Amino acid sequence: IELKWPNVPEQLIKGDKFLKWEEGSSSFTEILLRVDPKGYFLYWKIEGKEDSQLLDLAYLRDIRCAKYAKPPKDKKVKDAGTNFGSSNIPLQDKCVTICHGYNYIDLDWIHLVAENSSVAAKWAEEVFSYAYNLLSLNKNQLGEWEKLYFRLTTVEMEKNKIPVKSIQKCLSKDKDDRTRVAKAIEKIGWPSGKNDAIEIKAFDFDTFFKFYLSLLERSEIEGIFKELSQNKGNITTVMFRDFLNDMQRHPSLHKTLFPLYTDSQCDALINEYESAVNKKGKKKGQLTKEGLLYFLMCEENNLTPMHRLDLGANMKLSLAAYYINSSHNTYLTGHQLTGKSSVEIYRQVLLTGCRCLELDCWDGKDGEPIITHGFTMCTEVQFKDVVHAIAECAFKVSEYPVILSFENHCSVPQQKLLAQYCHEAFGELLLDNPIDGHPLKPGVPLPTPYDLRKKILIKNKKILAGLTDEEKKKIEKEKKDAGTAAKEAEAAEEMSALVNYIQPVHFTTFEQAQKKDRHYEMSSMVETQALNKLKDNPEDFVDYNKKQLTRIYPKGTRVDSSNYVPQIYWNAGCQLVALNFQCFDVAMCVNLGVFEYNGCSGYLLKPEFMRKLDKRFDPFTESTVDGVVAGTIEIKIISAQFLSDKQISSYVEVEMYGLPTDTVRKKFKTKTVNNNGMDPYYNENAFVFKKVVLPDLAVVRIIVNEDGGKFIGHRLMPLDGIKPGYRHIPLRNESNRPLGLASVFAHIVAKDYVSDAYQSAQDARAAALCAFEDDPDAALN
C-alpha cells in the first residue's frame, strides 16, 4: 500500500516569515507561518497580539505559487513584497495564494508573500500534499481527537500552557455542555476554572484520552465488553483474536490474501492499548474496558479498507471498463439560466478528482471565444483563460487522463482559436494523435487509463427515416431536453484533428453500433434519451458499454442544476455519468464519496461480470445474478459523538443505492435524541437490508440530520470491501471533507445471503426507477 501519512519538515514546524495582505486594501502584516507536526493546521501569530489565527487544512482547497498565484495590484503592497526577503527575484515568484472553503463553491482566500521562490514553492508543495493526504482524510476518531490535541498543543498554547477556555471553545458553545467540560477536566485532576491554563508537561495525550473517557458517557462499551468478556473478567488474548477474526471481519474475505490475526499479534496490540490506558495496572495479554474502547477508536479499527482506498485497481484495461468521474456544464457555479460562470470552478472540480469536464463554447463578440450557457442570462468567461486553468489543475490530484467535452457553437475562424489555445495551454498534455497499439480502426479496443496518464483528450465532433409516430414524438422530447447541445456548429478541420478516441456520434440503434464495431465512436446522451434506451433494451445497453463509452447529462428542465442519482446509469455500465458539481444534493454527495476510493483518481473499475463480453446482464433483475453472490447487510445505529457545539436534537438515517431492487431511501430513520450535541445515544434496533442482489454495485450511506431535517453530516461505505463489526464512523460534509470529531458508532453485519424460499416490460422498469426518487412512495404514482 503506497499511501503514507503526512511528514512535516522541521522548517515548517519552526516556521517561515511571510507578509499577508488582503484584496481591496492599502496595508498588510508580517507573520510567522507554521504547520503542526502532524500536518493538520496552518497557524500564525498576528503580531504583538493575543492569538494565533488558524486554517483547518481539512477545508483547504488549493495552495498556489509563482505564475499561478495572485500578485498584489495596490501600489504600496507591491513595494513591500519587492523589498521583502531578497530583492533579486520578481514579486510574482515570491507569491503564495491559498484558497479554502467548507465546500468548494463558496471560497475564502489568503494572500501571502515569501522571502524567495524556494520557500514559496516548498510551502506550496508541502501544504497541498497535507490537505489532500488520504490517510489524514480518513483517520478514525482517535486520530481526530489527536488532531484536537495538536490544535491545543500548538495553536492555543500560550507560554507552554493550554488555557481551559480554549479546551472549552473547541468542544462547545452551549453553557451546560461547557460545564460538562469543566467537571470532566476536574475528574482528571487538571485546573477547572474559567481562567486556568494546564502546564504542557502535565498535558500528555494519554491523559488527554482519559479526559475523553471522563467527558463522554460511552455506555455502549459496557455491553460490548460484557459480550466478549462474559463472566471471565477481562478480555484475554484469545477472546480478542476471535473478536478481530470473526466479528470484525467479512466471512467472505480471503484467508491467505488477508491473513487472520494471530495470538502473538494480539498480544502486541493489547500491550499498546493497555499502555495508553492502564500503565500502573496493565497485565500481559489482558484487555480492559478502556483498552477495548481505545481500539475501537484507533487506526486499526478504521472502517476504510486501505487496499480499496489506495490506487490499487487494475488500470490496464480498455477505457470502457471504468466508471469515470464526470462534470456537467462545469463552468456554472449556480442556477442554470441566471447563474454565474467561473474560471475558478474548473480548477476546483479537477481538484476533487473529476476527470470529465464540459466546455460550452460560444462565439465571443470581439474575436475571442467564450464559455457560457448560450441564450441565457448566465455570465460569460474567456475560453483562453479556462484552458490554462484546466492545464494548471488537471493532474494535481490524479495522474489519469482528463476528457474535455466540447459543445461547439463557434464560427470557423473562432474555432481555429479554440484549437490554437488548446495547443498553447496544454502543450504536451494534449493527445492530438492516437497512440501506438491503438489505431482508429474497427475491432481495436480503446487504450487503457494507464497508457493515457497525464494526457487530455478532446471530445468534439469530427468531420433515421422509417419510424412510428410515438417514436418521433419521444425523439422530439429528447432533442429539446438536450437544450443547447441539440444543435452544434459543424467541425473545423483544426478542431476535428484533435479528436481521436472520443468521437461523439449521433447514436441511432444498438444493433447499429456493434455492426460498425468502432470502439472509438461514443455517444453523449441527455438523460431523457438514456432512460428510453435503458427501459427498451437494458441488456443491449450493458453490452454496448463493454466496448464503447456512454456519457449521460441532466435534462434542460433541471433549471436548479438538480442531479439524478448516478447509480441509475452506472447500473447499465455508463462510464461518464456527468453531474452538476455546484449542487450538493444526494446525487452529488454520493458521487464524491464513491470517487474518493482508488487513490481518488477519478477512475473506478467496473465489476467483472460487467466487462465480460460473453455474459448477458439485466440491471432490472430482481432475482440473483449467476456467478455473483448476493448479500445481507445489517446496520445498527448506536450513538454519535460531537455532532455539534450547540445542544442540538438529532436523528440518523441509513440509505442504500445500487440496482433498483437494492436501492432503499426514506425507509430507515432512528428515534430522535433531543438536546444533546455531544453524546446522543440512539440505541436503535438494527436496520436490515435482507437481500442485496448485487453488492458490488451497491453503496450504503449513513446520514445524520438535525431535527428540522437540516443536514449535519454523512458517510459513504461501498459494499465492495466493507468492514463489519463495531466501527467508528467519522462524518463528512457534502463535499466529502471531514467534519472532524463528529462521528457515529454503529454495528455492521456483512455476509452472504442464504434463503428458505402483470404489467408492461418498460412500465415495470419505470416503476423500479422510483426507488431512486427523494420520495419513493409518492413519486411511485
Residue ranges of the binding site: 329, 358, 360, 407
Residue (111 or 558) nearer to Ca ion, CB: 558
- Contact segment (CB under 5 A) with Ca ion among 148-156, 359-367, 411-419, 492-500 equals 359-367
Residue (490 or 493) nearer to Ca ion, CB: 490
- Contact segment (CB under 5 A) with Ca ion among 36-44, 332-340, 355-363, 490-498 equals 355-363
Q: Which of 288, 329, 352, 529 binds Ca ion (CB under 5 A)?
A: 329
Residue (414 or 705) nearer to Ca ion, CB: 414
Strands (E) across 286-345 are located at: 286-287, 322-327
Shortest Cβ 331–Ca ion spacing (Å): 9
Shortest Cβ 553–Ca ion spacing (Å): 7
DSSP string, 707-761: TTS-EEEEEEEESTT---EEEEEEEE-TTS-EEEEEEEEEEEEEEE--------H
- Contact segment (CB under 5 A) with Ca ion among 37-45, 356-364, 375-383, 558-566 equals 356-364
DSSP string, 30-42: EEEEEE-TTS-EE
CA distances for 162 relative to 46, 152, 208, 216, angstroms? 19, 6, 12, 21
DSSP string, 49-98: SS-EEEEEGGGEEEEEEGGGS----SHHHHHHHHHSS-SSS-GGGGEEEE
Residue (357 or 664) nearer to Ca ion, CB: 357
By C-alpha distance, which of 214, 293, 171, 40 is closest to 742?
171
Asked if 747 is an active-site residue, the reply is: no
Q: For residues 301 and 259, give the distance between their C-alpha atoms in angstroms, rounded to a whole number.
A: 16
Residue (69 or 489) nearer to Ca ion, CB: 489
Query: CA torsion 154→159→162→168, rounded to 10°?
Result: -90
Residue (142 or 361) nearer to Ca ion, CB: 361
Q: Spell out, one character per residue from 203 to 242, where the chain touches Ca ion: x when CB under 5 A holds, - when not.
A: ----------------------------------------
Shortest Cβ 662–Ca ion spacing (Å): 31
Q: SS3 for 213? A: helix
Backbone phi, then psi, for 41, in 5-degree steps? Answer: -140, 140
Q: For residues 462 and 488, give the distance between their C-alpha atoms in angstroms, rounded to a whole number.
A: 12
Q: Spell out, one character per residue from 278 to 317, where the chain touches Ca ion: x when CB under 5 A holds, - when not.
A: ----------------------------------------
The residues in 129-148 that bind Ca ion, with binding defined as CB under 5 A, are none
Cell, residue 547: 466496448
- Contact segment (CB under 5 A) with Ca ion among 328-336, 433-441, 448-456, 703-711 equals 328-336
Shortest Cβ 360–Ca ion spacing (Å): 5
By C-alpha distance, which of 579, 603, 599 is closest to 589?
579
Asked if 714 is an active-site residue, the reply is: no
Of the candidates 328, 388, 409, 519, the residue annotated as catalytic is 328
How many residues bind Ca ion (CB under 5 A)? The answer is 2
CA distances for 436 relative to 150, 440, 441, 444, 777, angstroms? 52, 10, 12, 12, 53
Helix (H) or strand (E) holding 293: helix 289-297
Residue (378 or 769) nearer to Ca ion, CB: 378
Q: For residues 739 and 497, give the distance between their C-alpha atoms in angstroms, rounded to a whole number.
A: 47
CA distances for 375 relative to 241, 528, 750, 773, angstroms? 66, 22, 51, 31
Q: For residues 429 and 57, give the distance between their C-alpha atoms in angstroms, rounded to a whole number.
A: 30
Shortest Cβ 326–Ca ion spacing (Å): 12
CB count within 10 Å of CB 241 equals 19
CB count within 10 Å of CB 9 equals 10
Residue (92 or 379) nearer to Ca ion, CB: 379
CA distances for 399 relative to 384, 452, 454, 727, angstroms? 23, 9, 6, 32
Q: For residues 57 and 490, give the distance between their C-alpha atoms in angstroms, rounded to a whole number.
A: 46
Residue (373 or 732) nearer to Ca ion, CB: 373
- Contact segment (CB under 5 A) with Ca ion among 215-223, 354-362, 364-372, 590-598 equals 354-362
Shortest Cβ 47–Ca ion spacing (Å): 50
By C-alpha distance, which of 735, 700, 736, 725 is closest to 303?
725
Residue (270 or 418) nearer to Ca ion, CB: 418
Shortest Cβ 329–Ca ion spacing (Å): 5
Helix (H) or strand (E) holding 382: strand 381-382
By C-alpha distance, which of 216, 132, 233 is closest to 181?
216
The residues in 530-559 that bind Ca ion, with binding defined as CB under 5 A, are none
**From the annotation, which residues make up the binding site for Ca(2+)?**
329, 358, 360, 407
Regarding 408 and contact with Ca ion (CB under 5 A), the answer is no
Shortest Cβ 591–Ca ion spacing (Å): 18
- Contact segment (CB under 5 A) with Ca ion among 323-331, 377-385, 452-460, 619-627 equals 323-331
Of the candidates 100, 111, 373, 714, the residue annotated as catalytic is 373
Shortest Cβ 498–Ca ion spacing (Å): 19
- Contact segment (CB under 5 A) with Ca ion among 285-293, 322-330, 625-633, 717-725 equals 322-330
Q: Which residues are catalytic?
A: 328, 373
Return residues touching Ca ion (CB under 5 A): 329, 360
